[PDB]
C-alpha cells in the first residue's frame, strides 16, 4: 500500500518511488531507504545514543568530524 | 604522537583541536580530503623552553635530544645565555641526518661559540669557536631576537729569548695562555676578552671580542682567527637580528 | 498487546513499530525500544547501537559529532 | 503480527527476519534491519545522514577508517 500511518495520520512510512520508502513524522520527510541506502533528508540528523559503528571493508565519510 | 586505536581522543590530546580538519593542520597534514588513519604516528611541533643559563653547553646533548623526537619538528625558545663548553666544537650542530622535519631557534638571549685560548711563547692564539654549524639547510629556521656570536680568537703568545708569556683568552670565557714561567694571560669573562700578559712595551696579545680575531703580541705572534656565527649551509632567517661574526 | 493499538506488529506481537506520541515513532524488538524517529531526527535509545556494514556517510554542511573515535 | 508490511508494493517494506528481528527491504534487496540491541545495514549497504551524524553519550564511533573531505 501507498501509506502506512503510525498513530497520527501525518506520521509513518510511505511510497517514495519505485523501490523507495519515505520516513515521515508530522508531515516532515525525515529520511527513507532504497535498495542501497538508509538515509536522512537534508538537515535531518542520525543520532546513536549507544555506539555508532562501521564494520567491514568500507569506511566513514564526512565533511568534518568533531571529537569532544 | 597520535596513536590508534583511539585516534579521536588521541588527536584531541595531541593537537588541542576537536575538529579533525583543524587537528590535521596541527599535524601538518595537507591532503584534502584526508584519511584519519594518516594522523597515526604524527605529532604537533614540540616547543622547548630553556631558561637555564649554560656556559658549558655540549652540542652532542642537543643532537641526542633532537634524535629522540624522531621526525617531530622542534621549536626551541632560548631565554638564557648559552656558551659552548669548548672552542673546538660549535655551540649547536645540526647534522645532515637529523630526522626532525624542521628545527626553529627562537633566540631571546645571547648565544656564543666559546672564546679561543691565548697562545704561549712563539705560538699564535687559538681560533674562536663557532656558534652554529648548520648541515640541514632551510630545515633550520632562526628567529634571532638576541645575539648570535662567534667566539673571539685568543691573543698571540709572547716570547723573546728565554722569556715566555701567554695571550688573553677570546670572549666569551676563553682561557688565557699559561706559560712555562706562569707569565699567563687572563681568562676572558662572558662580556669581555682577557688581557694578555703585559710588561711595559712587551706584551702577549689580548683576546678578541666576539666575532673578532685575537690581538697579535708585541713579538708579532698572531691572534687566533675569529669564531663564526653560522657555518655550513644557510638556514631560513625568520629574523637575522644582531650577529657578531660571519654567517650565511 | 505490548505494542498496543497504534502499532504495526512485524513477525510477533512485541516487535515492530509503535506510536510514541504525535509525530513520534518507536522502533521495537522483543519489547525493547531500540530507537525511533521524529520530525527532525532518526535515533537509537541509550545504549542501543547503529551499525553500517557498508559505508557510514555524512554529506553536506553538517558534521559528524562523537565522544571518541576508534579506528581499526 | 504480519510476516510482511508492503510499502508501495510487495517487494519493498518491512519483513519478519527471525525472532525479534525485522528486515528492511527495497525491491527485495535486504538493505538492513533491526533487533533488540541494534539498527544496522547489511554488507555493502550504506547509512547516510544529510544533516549531522552523531554519537551521543558514553559510547563511541568504531570504524575501519574515516575520510574527511
Ligand atoms: Mg495531515
Ligand atoms: Mg525527494
Ligand atoms: Mg500533525
Ligand atoms: Mg632587525
Ligand atoms: Mg517476541
Ligand atoms: Mg518492482
Curated annotation (Swiss-Prot), chain A:
Chain spans, region Interaction with the receptor-recognizing protein gp38: 64-67
Source taxon at top rank: Viruses
Cell compartments where the protein resides: Virion
Post-translational modifications reported in the UniProt record: Proteolytic cleavage and release of the chaperone in the host cytosol stabilizes the folded protein.
Subunit structure: Homotrimer. Interacts with the receptor-recognizing protein Gp38.
Family statement drawn from the similarity comment of this UniProt entry: Belongs to the S16-like long tail fiber protein Gp37 family.
Entry protein name: Long tail fiber protein Gp37
Species whose genome carries this gene: Salmonella phage S16
Lineage: Viruses, Duplodnaviria, Heunggongvirae, Uroviricota, Caudoviricetes
From Swiss-Prot, chain B:
Sorted UniProt keywords: Host-virus interaction, Receptor, Viral attachment to host cell, Viral tail protein, Virion, Virus entry into host cell
Site feature: Interaction with the fiber protein p37: 6, 19, 35
InterPro entries: Gp38_N (IPR048291), Receptor-recog_Gp38 (IPR007932)
Motif (GRM 7): 191-198
Placement of sequence motif GRM 2: 123-130
Residue span of motif GRM 4: 163-171
Domain-related comment: The N-terminus is involved in binding to the fiber protein p37. The C-terminus contains glycine-rich motifs (GRM) and mediates the host specificity. The glycine-rich motifs assemble into a 3-layered PG(II) sandwich domain.
Short motif (GRM 5): ranges: 174-180
Family of the protein in this entry: Belongs to the S16-like receptor-recognizing protein gp38 family.
This protein's GO CC annotations: virus tail
GO terms, biological process: adhesion receptor-mediated virion attachment to host cell; symbiont entry into host cell
Annotated signal sequence range: none
Short motif GRM 9, span: 212-217
Assembly notes: Interacts with host OmpC receptor; this interaction allows the reversible adsorption of the phage on the host membrane.
Residue ranges annotated as motif GRM 6: 183-189
Key word Membrane present: no
Chain's role: Receptor binding protein (RBP) that is at the tip of the long tail fibers and serves as the phage recognition site for the attachment host receptor OmpC.
Disulphide-bridged cysteine pairs: none
Name of the molecule in the record: Receptor-recognizing protein gp38
Motif (GRM 1): 113-120
Residue numbers covered by motif GRM 10: 221-228
Organism: Salmonella phage S16
Amino acid at each position: 500500500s501507498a501509506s502506512i500511518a503510525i498513530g497520527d495520520n501525518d506520521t509513518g512510512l510511505r511510497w517514495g518511488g519505485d523501490g523507495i520508502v519515505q520516513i515521515v513524522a508530522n508531515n516532515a520527510i525525515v529520511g527513507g531507504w532504497n535498495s542501497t541506502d538508509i538515509f536522512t533528508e537534508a538537515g535531518k540528523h542520525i543520532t546513536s545514543n549507544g555506539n555508532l559503528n562501521q564494520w567491514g571493508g568500507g569506511a566513514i565519510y564526512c565533511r568534518d568530524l568533531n571529537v569532544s | 604522537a597520535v596513536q590508534g586505536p583511539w585516534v579521536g581522543s588521541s588527536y584531541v590530546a595531541e593537537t588541542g583541536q576537536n575538529w579533525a580538519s583543524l587537528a590535521a593542520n596541527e599535524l601538518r597534514v595537507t591532503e584534502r580530503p584526508f584519511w584519519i588513519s594518516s594522523f597515526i604516528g604524527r605529532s604537533k611541533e614540540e616547543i622547548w623552553e630553556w631558561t637555564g643559563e649554560n656556559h658549558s653547553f655540549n652540542k652532542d646533548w642537543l643532537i641526542g635530544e633532537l634524535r629522540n623526537r624522531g621526525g617531530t619538528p622542534v621549536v626551541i625558545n632560548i631565554r638564557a645565555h648559552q656558551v659552548s663548553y669548548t672552542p673546538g666544537a660549535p655551540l649547536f650542530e645540526f647534522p645532515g641526518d637529523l630526522p626532525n622535519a624542521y628545527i626553529t631557534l627562537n633566540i631571546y638571549a645571547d648565544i656564543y661559540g666559546r672564546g679561543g685560548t691565548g697562545g704561549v711563547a712563539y705560538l699564535g692564539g687559538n681560533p674562536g669557536g663557532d656558534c652554529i654549524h648548520n648541515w640541514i639547510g632551510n630545515r633550520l629556521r632562526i628567529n634571532n631576537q638576541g645575539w648570535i656570536c662567534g667566539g673571539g680568537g685568543g691573543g698571540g703568545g709572547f716570547r723573546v729569548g728565554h722569556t715566555e708569556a701567554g695571550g688573553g683568552g677570546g670572549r666569551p670565557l676563553g682561557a688565557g695562555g699559561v706559560s712555562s714561567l706562569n707569565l699567563n694571560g687572563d681568562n676572558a669573562t662572558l662580556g669581555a676578552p682577557g688581557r694578555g700578559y703585559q710588561l711595559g712595551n712587551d706584551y702577549a696579545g689580548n683576546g678578541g671580542d666576539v666575532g673578532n680575531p685575537g690581538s697579535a703580541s708585541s713579538a708579532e705572534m698572531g691572534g687566533g682567527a675569529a669564531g663564526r656565527a653560522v657555518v655550513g649551509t644557510s638556514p631560513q632567517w625568520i629574523n637575522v637580528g644582531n650577529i657578531a661574526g660571519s654567517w650565511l
